[PDB]
Amino acid sequence: HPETLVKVKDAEDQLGGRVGYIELDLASGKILESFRPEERFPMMSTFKVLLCGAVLSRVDAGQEQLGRRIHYSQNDLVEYSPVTEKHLTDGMTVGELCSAAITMSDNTAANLLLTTIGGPKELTAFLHNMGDHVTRLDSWEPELNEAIPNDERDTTTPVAMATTLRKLLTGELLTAASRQQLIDWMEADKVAGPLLRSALPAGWFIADKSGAGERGSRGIIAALGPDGKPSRIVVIYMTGSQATMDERNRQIAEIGASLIKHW
Ligand SMILES: [Ca+2]
Fold first, then answer.
1. Collapsing DSSP states into helix, strand and coil, what is residue 247?
2. Which residues are annotated as a binding site for Ca(2+)?
3. Which residue among 50, 72, 178, 245 is least crowded, i.e. fewest CB within 10 A of its CB?
4. 238 CA to centre of ligand 1 in angstroms
5. Could you give the maximum distance between any two Cα atoms of the chain, in Å?
């Protein structure tokens, strides 16, 4: 029931740490509402979307194919690889790898895709090449997750992430088929149910990616809107508190209810 900015500031009051929030109009790119928009937060697994953006960029350029099959071994597996650990004999295609990285937050799938483009510093270069000189990836999985403060490593700001997400989803940086593929993976997200999804009314569209980390970190990037079609981008990050997972999740779901009731 409180207005969205009030609820965001309330969430920070209750949790400690910092909460960062932006709501952007997808068609116009106008900032509709913000809180700590230019401050840095850890990205956590929300970078997996930007990673698959870079893959699809290579596909549109003729340097990659989504059906290319990648084989790997048990020695490649890292913590939290629920899809990739099931495909040791058959491997996965590049397209399956993006689906696993986005929809299940598979860490081996992300690492494998980062190998295809030459590592974290190459993802950062792709972002620079599209006009985002703020967001940076420095680490491989699973060692994003870990003790965060700060540095600037593996961080973005709400306005940078949102702007960069809008460029990927609606710009002419990717072909129409690649833009639709990226949004299809986000729509099929399986691991974000307690977050914005828990507040969404019947018949709304949502395409999202969540993140979680140490030092009270949690976040979500999402494109959503009524009647089957996305119309706004919403970015929420939090970090720096001693809050439990259940506490973090609840605050994001309450921010979500506010945003919906005041649409
Ligand atoms: Ca405050």
1. helix
2. 12
3. 245
4. 12
5. 52
Nearest-angstrom CA–CA distance, 71 and 158:
36
> How far is the centre of ligand 1, averaged over its atoms, from the C-alpha of 18 (Å)?
7
Cα–Cα distance measured from residue 38 to residue 119, given in angstroms and rounded to the nearest whole number? 26
User: What CATH number was assigned to the domain covering residues 1-263?
Assistant: 3.40.710.10
| CA–CA dist 142, 146 (Å, integer) | 8
> Token match 């059906």: residue?
67
Residue 217 annotated as catalytic: no
Contact of 210 with 191, CB cutoff 8 Å: yes
**Beta carbons within 8 Å of 181's beta carbon, 6+ residues apart:** 56, 66, 95
Taking the centre of ligand 1 as the mean of its atom positions, its distance from the CA of residue 14, in whole angstroms, is: 10
The answer for residues whose C-beta is within 8 angstroms of residue 43's C-beta and 6 or more apart is: 135, 137, 144, 154, 155, 156, 161, 211, 219
Active site annotation includes 198: no
Q: Which residues define the annotated binding site?
A: 12
Span from the CA of 28 to the centroid of ligand 1 (angstroms): 30
Peptide bond into 150 cis (omega under 30): yes
Counted residue by residue, the chain has a size of 263
Cα–Cα distances in Å, from 49 out to 25, 36, 100, 178?
19, 22, 11, 13
Query: Does residue 174 sit in helix, strand or coil?
Result: coil
The active-site residue out of 45, 57, 99, 105 is 45
Contact criterion met (CB below 8 Å) for 201 and 228: no
Provide the resolution (angstroms): 1.8
Q: Check 38, 79, 85, 143 and give the catalytic one.
A: 143
Measured in angstroms, how far is the CA atom of residue 261 from the centroid of ligand 1? 23
